[model samples]
Target: DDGLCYEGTNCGKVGKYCCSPIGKYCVCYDSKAICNKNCT
Candidate 1:
């Protein structure tokens, strides 16, 4: 599946992807995919 994190979709479910808050939705980015304290 594409690494697209929607507003209602949970990015945590995706592998090696993180949710980046956007205008009205979330975008999945590989950069912050790692388990870091800053990421949610």
Candidate 2:
């Protein structure tokens, strides 16, 4: 996790819910989700 543990927001892509938190999440965009490229 980074300085801020990522929280989810509505994705710009329709039908695509924002995925955050754990492995359960669909896909947390590295840029958008504030990921550290280690979200896996």
How accurate locally, in lDDT, is each candidate? 0.40, 0.42
Off by over 4 Å in 2: 1-9, 22-39
Every model: Cα RMSD to truth: 8.9, 8.1
- lDDT for each residue of candidate 1 in 1-40, tens digit (9 for 90 to 100): 2223333325543544445544323444445543232344
Error of 1 at 1 (Å): 27
lDDT of 2 by residue, 1-40 (tens): 4322344544332332344454444454545443445333
Q: Clash pairs of candidate 1?
A: none
Model 1 residue 10 lDDT score: 59
Worst 10 residues of 2 by lDDT: 10-19
Instruction: Write down the lDDT that model 2 would get.
Output: 0.42
Model 1 stretches astray by more than 4 angstroms: 1-9, 20-23, 33-40
